[PDB]
Amino acid sequence: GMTEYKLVVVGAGGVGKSALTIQLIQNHFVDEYDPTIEDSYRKQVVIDGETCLLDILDTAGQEEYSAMRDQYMRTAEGFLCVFAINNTKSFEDIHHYREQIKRVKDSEDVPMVLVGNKCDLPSRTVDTKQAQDLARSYGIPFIETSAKTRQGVDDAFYTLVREIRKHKE
Amino acid sequence: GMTEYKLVVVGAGGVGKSALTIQLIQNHFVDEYDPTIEDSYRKQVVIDGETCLLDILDTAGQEEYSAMRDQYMRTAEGFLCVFAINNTKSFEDIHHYREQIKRVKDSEDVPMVLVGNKCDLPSRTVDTKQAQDLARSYGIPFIETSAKTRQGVDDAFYTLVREIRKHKE
Numbered sequence: 001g002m003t004e005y006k007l008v009v010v011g012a013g014g015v016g017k018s019a020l021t022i023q024l025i026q027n028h029f030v031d032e033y034d035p036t037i038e039d040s041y042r043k044q045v046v047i048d049g050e051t052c053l054l055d056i057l058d059t060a061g062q063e064e065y066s067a068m069r070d071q072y073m074r075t076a077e078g079f080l081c082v083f084a085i086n087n088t089k090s091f092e093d094i095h096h097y098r099e100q101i102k103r104v105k106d107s108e109d110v111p112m113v114l115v116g117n118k119c120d121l122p123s124r125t126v127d128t129k130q131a132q133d134l135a136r137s138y139g140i141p142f143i144e145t146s147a148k149t150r151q152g153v154d155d156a157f158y159t160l161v162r163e164i165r166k167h168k169e
Numbered sequence: 170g171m172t173e174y175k176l177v178v179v180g181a182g183g184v185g186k187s188a189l190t191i192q193l194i195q196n197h198f199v200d201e202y203d204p205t206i207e208d209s210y211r212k213q214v215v216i217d218g219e220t221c222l223l224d225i226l227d228t229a230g231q232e233e234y235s236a237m238r239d240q241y242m243r244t245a246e247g248f249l250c251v252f253a254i255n256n257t258k259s260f261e262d263i264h265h266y267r268e269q270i271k272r273v274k275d276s277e278d279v280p281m282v283l284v285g286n287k288c289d290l291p292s293r294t295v296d297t298k299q300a301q302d303l304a305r306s307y308g309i310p311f312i313e314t315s316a317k318t319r320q321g322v323d324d325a326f327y328t329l330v331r332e333i334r335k336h337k338e
């Protein structure tokens with residue numbers, strides 16, 4: 001049937017993983033989303049003229065057991081690694097998330113996008129060059145996003161889908 | 170195996186995409202064809218003395234998933250972009266369709282014809298020069314048609330096929 005793409009959003013708490021998911025799914029910005037809510041979202045889209053379904057797991061803290069986490073991490077085809085451009089710690093924490101994906105997927109070639117969220121905020125502590133440099137080093141795309149403005153949210157998810165398509169071609 | 174040309178008709182609802190297809194297929198003008206109906210038509214024709222088959226998808230621009238739509242947009246060889254000369258909005262909407270075509274065909278060199286329909290009407294708000302100028306900008310032909318009078322309907326479709334023949338030359 002219709003192609004399904006299983007995506008997982010990873011990153012340090014507070015970077016805007018839920019705001020980005022919900023912007024994509026529900027086309028609105030939520031100012032408060034309880035940190036501990038972990039859940040998956042399905043949305044039909046058209047990417048480069050291809051009608052497909054995005055199956056997205058919005059991840060929370062790595063403390064608590066999630067039955068959903070097990071299946072997705074196992075079966076996921078693509079990952080958004082999200083940092084916040086006003087959170088230096090979160091950008092420093094990116095290599096971790098990527099090394100955990102490689103280990104769980106037992107593979108050095110997992111489709112991934114590097115996402116710098118909160119581009120709507122005027123004091124960046126993580127600049128464009130540093131983000132471009134990391135992504136280049138990983139051989140993945142970097143996309144600047146605002147969950148509040150919708151800036152580049154579609155771009156990030158569509159770029160991961162395109163990255164998955166190339167992993168099969 | 171007889172040569173098949175897969176054509177897709179695109180444009181804003183109400184420009185006469187269905188009227189033009191049915192004029193070509195059934196050699197009559199239909200005043201009432203459900204705006205939301207999308208389907209494909211196959212018709213044997215003779216172009217410049219070549220007996221070929223036209224496989225045309227008359228698009229309705231609907232939301233629900235259609236495997237046939239996806240197949241046609243991916244496998245198509247040529248596109249009619251249709252506006253109505255008494256519909257300024259529809260001519261303004263032409264760039265959107267061309268950009269969708271570029272994205273799905275993964276190319277900036279896709280056989281295309283710009284079609285200005287309803288030249289039987291005296292209330293023209295989109296003049297010949299502006300249509301010629303857009304087509305020149307895109308590097309494609311512009312053809313004036315009337316589904317009701319059957320003016321240039323054959324010309325529109327046969328012009329697209331010739332454009333496809335040159336792409337494959």
Ligand SMILES: Nc1nc2c(ncn2[C@@H]2O[C@H](COP(=O)(O)OP(=O)(O)O)[C@@H](O)[C@H]2O)c(=O)[nH]1
Pocket residue numbers: 012013014015016017018019020030031032033034035117118119120121145146147148149
């Ligand atoms: N200005 C701004 N605030 C954002 C953005 N994304 C998330 N936020 C806010 O940052 C906080 C954390 O967002 P949340 O989605 O809970 O983060 P998560 O735990 O990483 O999923 C909330 O107050 C959000 O409203 C963004 O792009 N811009």
Ligand SMILES: Nc1nc2c(ncn2[C@@H]2O[C@H](COP(=O)(O)OP(=O)(O)O)[C@@H](O)[C@H]2O)c(=O)[nH]1
Pocket residue numbers: 180181182183184185186187188189199200201202203204286287288289290314315316317318
């Ligand atoms: N006068 C005139 N009316 C037309 C012409 N082509 C279509 N129509 C009418 O305009 C409307 C739109 O036609 P339709 O085929 O439904 O457009 P579509 O939605 O683009 O497929 C219908 O009421 C048609 O009868 C034309 O060349 N001249």
Ligand SMILES: [Mg+2]
Pocket residue numbers: 017018019033034035036037059060
């Ligand atoms: Mg959250």
Ligand SMILES: [Mg+2]
Pocket residue numbers: 186187188202203204205206227228229
């Ligand atoms: Mg129609």
